[PDB]
Amino acid sequence: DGVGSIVPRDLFERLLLHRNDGACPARGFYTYEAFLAAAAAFPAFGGTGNTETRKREVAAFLGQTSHETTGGWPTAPDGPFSWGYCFKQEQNPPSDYCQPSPEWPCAPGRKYYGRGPIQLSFNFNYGPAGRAIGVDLLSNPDLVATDATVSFKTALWFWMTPQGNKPSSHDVITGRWAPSPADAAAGRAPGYGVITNIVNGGLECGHGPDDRVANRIGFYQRYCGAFGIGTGGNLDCYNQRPFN
C-alpha cells in the first residue's frame, strides 16, 4: 500500500543505526514518521517495480543521501557505513549560495547552503523544490533543517526529478532509464554508478577509483545486504564521463 510495507521501523533504525549518537548534530531530527510522510507525497518512490526493485530504490536513495550526511570514519563502531544521516546542514559553508536569478530571487538575509539528506544548495534549487512540494523554500530555506518532513521531501524531489540531460535517479534504479548512444559512448550504463554521476559526477566520476564514490558504494552494499537483495552491477562511475 506504501513504502512502510517494505521498510518497517526496525529495519530503518538499523539501516540508520548511529544517526542519533551524541556526536551527531542532527540527532533526533530524522524520524521514521518523517520519512513516511515524505514518501507518501511521492508514491512512485518505493512503488515502482517488484518488491526487490522497490527495496533497491530505498537502498540506493538511502545510500546516496547517507553519504551526503555521514559522520563516519574508518574505525567507527559498526563500520563507517552505519553512520549515515549524522548531519542536516552544511558545516562551515563558505557562502550564502545565492546566485541572483530573475526566476528565483533571494530573500534578503536568507542563506541557501546545504541542508537535508541530499544537501540541497543554492536559491535555484530551493525555489523549484519549494514549488514542487507546496512550501516557499526561497523565503524559508531553514525549513529543510528544522522540519524533517520537508527535509526528506527535498531529497525525494531531487531523487524523482530529472534535470536537463540527466534522468531521474528513480528511473535509473527502477530500470525505466534507457541509455542514449552518447551514454554508451561515455561509459554510462544502468546501475548505482550512474546515480553517483547524477548526484556529483562533475567532481567524482570519470577519473578512476575515487574514495567519495567508494563511500557511496559502501553504504549501498550494506543497505542491500540488510534488505536481502543484490546490488545490481555497474556500482561505480570510475570510467564514466560526467553528465556535467
Side-chain angles (χ1 to χ4, degrees):
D1 230 84
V3 88
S5 72
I6 68 155
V7 47
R9 195 185 289 281
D10 79 279
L11 221 207
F12 176 97
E13 297 289 348
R14 209 187 69 241
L15 285 176
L16 311 182
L17 200 49
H18 295 291
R19 78 190 190 282
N20 285 328
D21 255 63
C24 283
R27 73 204 237 71
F29 185 66
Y30 298 114
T31 53
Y32 184 64
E33 293 87 54
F35 177 60
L36 303 182
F42 295 87
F45 180 77
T48 302
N50 59 211
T51 299
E52 165 159 49
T53 300
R54 285 174 192 199
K55 282 167 171 176
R56 188 166 304 112
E57 171 156 39
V58 170
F61 167 82
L62 283 179
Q64 299 286 340
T65 49
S66 283
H67 172 77
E68 303 296 336
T69 57
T70 186
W73 65 100
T75 63
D78 309 288
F81 314 124
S82 55
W83 287 78
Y85 275 78
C86 191
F87 301 87
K88 59 171 191 183
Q89 54 191 286
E90 189 180 333
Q91 303 165 263
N92 305 304
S95 183
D96 290 347
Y97 292 92
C98 159
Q99 187 170 323
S101 172
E103 313 213 331
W104 313 112
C106 304
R110 304 297 78 78
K111 304 150 194 36
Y112 309 97
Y113 53 74
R115 295 174 181 95
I118 212 56
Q119 281 282 287
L120 188 70
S121 300
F122 294 97
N123 56 312
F124 54 75
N125 299 142
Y126 279 82
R131 276 249 287 276
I133 73 162
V135 181
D136 174 32
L137 287 184
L138 219 42
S139 314
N140 321 108
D142 308 271
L143 279 178
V144 189
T146 51
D147 180 337
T149 293
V150 176
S151 191
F152 276 114
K153 287 197 186 199
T154 54
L156 290 179
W157 162 76
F158 175 87
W159 192 257
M160 302 294 304
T161 310
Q163 274 184 198
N165 80 307
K166 315 180 271 293
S168 70
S169 292
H170 165 74
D171 288 344
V172 179
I173 207 62
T174 60
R176 301 168 53 78
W177 177 61
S180 91
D183 288 333
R188 300 189 276 251
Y192 190 76
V194 189
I195 303 168
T196 292
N197 205 330
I198 293 168
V199 173
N200 200 216
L203 275 192
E204 300 189 20
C205 303
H207 57 243
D210 187 286
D211 297 346
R212 296 160 304 196
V213 181
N215 173 261
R216 294 173 187 285
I217 293 173
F219 275 112
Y220 182 51
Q221 285 177 315
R222 180 195 178 232
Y223 291 155
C224 288
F227 272 124
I229 60 179
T231 57
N234 315 2
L235 297 187
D236 72 82
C237 65
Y238 305 160
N239 306 116
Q240 294 187 195
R241 181 198 170 85
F243 287 107
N244 163 148

Short mmCIF file of all heavy atoms in Angstrom, two decimals, residues 18 37 73 95 101 105 115 141 155 163 168 176-177 207 235 240:
data_model
loop_
_atom_site.label_atom_id
_atom_site.label_comp_id
_atom_site.label_asym_id
_atom_site.label_seq_id
_atom_site.Cartn_x
_atom_site.Cartn_y
_atom_site.Cartn_z
N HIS A 18 23.42 4.72 13.73
CA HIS A 18 24.08 5.68 14.59
C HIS A 18 23.68 7.15 14.40
O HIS A 18 24.08 8.00 15.18
CB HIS A 18 25.59 5.51 14.50
CG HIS A 18 26.08 4.20 15.03
ND1 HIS A 18 26.04 3.87 16.38
CD2 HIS A 18 26.66 3.15 14.40
CE1 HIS A 18 26.56 2.67 16.55
NE2 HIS A 18 26.94 2.20 15.37
N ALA A 37 5.89 10.22 5.89
CA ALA A 37 5.09 11.35 5.44
C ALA A 37 5.68 11.93 4.18
O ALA A 37 4.94 12.27 3.25
CB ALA A 37 5.01 12.41 6.48
N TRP A 73 33.78 7.31 10.05
CA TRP A 73 35.24 7.33 9.99
C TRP A 73 35.64 5.87 10.03
O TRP A 73 34.84 5.06 10.48
CB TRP A 73 35.86 8.10 11.17
CG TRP A 73 35.66 7.50 12.55
CD1 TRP A 73 36.57 6.77 13.27
CD2 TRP A 73 34.52 7.65 13.40
NE1 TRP A 73 36.05 6.44 14.51
CE2 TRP A 73 34.79 6.96 14.61
CE3 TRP A 73 33.28 8.29 13.26
CZ2 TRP A 73 33.88 6.88 15.65
CZ3 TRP A 73 32.36 8.21 14.31
CH2 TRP A 73 32.67 7.51 15.49
N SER A 95 29.65 30.35 1.90
CA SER A 95 28.82 31.27 1.16
C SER A 95 27.36 31.17 1.58
O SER A 95 27.00 30.27 2.35
CB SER A 95 28.99 30.94 -0.32
OG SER A 95 28.27 31.83 -1.13
N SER A 101 18.80 35.34 -9.49
CA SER A 101 18.16 34.88 -10.71
C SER A 101 16.79 35.53 -10.78
O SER A 101 16.07 35.57 -9.75
CB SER A 101 18.03 33.36 -10.72
OG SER A 101 17.25 32.91 -11.82
N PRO A 105 14.38 34.75 -7.02
CA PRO A 105 15.16 35.77 -6.32
C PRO A 105 15.60 35.25 -4.96
O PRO A 105 15.05 34.26 -4.49
CB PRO A 105 14.18 36.92 -6.17
CG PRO A 105 12.84 36.25 -6.15
CD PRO A 105 12.96 35.12 -7.11
N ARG A 115 21.36 21.80 3.05
CA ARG A 115 20.51 21.26 4.11
C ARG A 115 19.84 19.96 3.69
O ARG A 115 19.52 19.76 2.52
CB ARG A 115 19.41 22.25 4.48
CG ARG A 115 19.89 23.57 5.10
CD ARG A 115 18.73 24.50 5.28
NE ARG A 115 19.10 25.80 5.84
CZ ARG A 115 19.36 26.91 5.16
NH1 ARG A 115 19.38 26.95 3.84
NH2 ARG A 115 19.63 28.02 5.83
N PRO A 141 14.15 28.89 3.69
CA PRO A 141 15.00 27.72 3.43
C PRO A 141 15.36 26.91 4.66
O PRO A 141 15.59 25.69 4.53
CB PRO A 141 16.27 28.32 2.80
CG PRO A 141 16.22 29.76 3.09
CD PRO A 141 14.79 30.14 3.21
N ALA A 155 14.94 15.87 -0.59
CA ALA A 155 15.75 14.73 -1.03
C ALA A 155 14.99 13.89 -2.06
O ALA A 155 15.56 13.55 -3.11
CB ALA A 155 16.16 13.85 0.16
N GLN A 163 16.71 16.31 -14.42
CA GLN A 163 17.30 17.65 -14.56
C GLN A 163 18.10 17.74 -15.83
O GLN A 163 19.12 17.07 -15.95
CB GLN A 163 18.28 17.96 -13.41
CG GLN A 163 17.60 18.52 -12.17
CD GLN A 163 18.56 18.91 -11.04
OE1 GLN A 163 18.12 19.05 -9.87
NE2 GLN A 163 19.88 19.08 -11.37
N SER A 168 16.08 10.97 -13.93
CA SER A 168 15.93 10.83 -12.52
C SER A 168 16.72 9.62 -12.00
O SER A 168 16.82 8.59 -12.67
CB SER A 168 14.46 10.67 -12.18
OG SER A 168 14.00 9.41 -12.61
N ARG A 176 13.75 2.05 -15.56
CA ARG A 176 12.99 2.74 -16.62
C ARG A 176 13.96 3.44 -17.57
O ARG A 176 13.62 3.68 -18.72
CB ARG A 176 11.96 3.73 -16.06
CG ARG A 176 10.91 3.08 -15.14
CD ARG A 176 10.07 4.08 -14.33
NE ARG A 176 9.44 5.10 -15.18
CZ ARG A 176 8.35 4.92 -15.92
NH1 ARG A 176 7.72 3.77 -15.95
NH2 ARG A 176 7.89 5.92 -16.65
N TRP A 177 15.17 3.76 -17.11
CA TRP A 177 16.07 4.55 -17.93
C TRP A 177 16.80 3.73 -19.00
O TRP A 177 17.44 2.74 -18.71
CB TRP A 177 17.09 5.27 -17.07
CG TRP A 177 18.08 6.03 -17.87
CD1 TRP A 177 17.82 7.05 -18.73
CD2 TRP A 177 19.49 5.81 -17.91
NE1 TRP A 177 18.99 7.48 -19.30
CE2 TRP A 177 20.03 6.73 -18.80
CE3 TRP A 177 20.34 4.91 -17.28
CZ2 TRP A 177 21.38 6.81 -19.05
CZ3 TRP A 177 21.70 4.99 -17.55
CH2 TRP A 177 22.20 5.92 -18.42
N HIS A 207 37.50 9.50 -13.50
CA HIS A 207 38.94 9.60 -13.30
C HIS A 207 39.47 8.51 -12.41
O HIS A 207 40.39 8.75 -11.65
CB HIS A 207 39.36 10.98 -12.76
CG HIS A 207 38.70 11.36 -11.48
ND1 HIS A 207 37.86 12.45 -11.38
CD2 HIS A 207 38.73 10.78 -10.26
CE1 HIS A 207 37.39 12.52 -10.15
NE2 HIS A 207 37.89 11.52 -9.45
N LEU A 235 28.29 -0.60 -10.18
CA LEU A 235 28.24 0.13 -8.92
C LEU A 235 29.03 1.45 -8.91
O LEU A 235 28.78 2.29 -8.05
CB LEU A 235 28.79 -0.74 -7.79
CG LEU A 235 28.06 -2.04 -7.42
CD1 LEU A 235 28.70 -2.63 -6.17
CD2 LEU A 235 26.55 -1.81 -7.22
N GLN A 240 33.23 6.68 -16.31
CA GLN A 240 32.05 7.33 -16.90
C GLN A 240 32.40 8.77 -17.11
O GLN A 240 32.85 9.43 -16.19
CB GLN A 240 30.83 7.26 -15.98
CG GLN A 240 30.29 5.88 -15.73
CD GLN A 240 28.99 5.90 -14.97
OE1 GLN A 240 28.54 4.88 -14.45
NE2 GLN A 240 28.37 7.06 -14.89
#
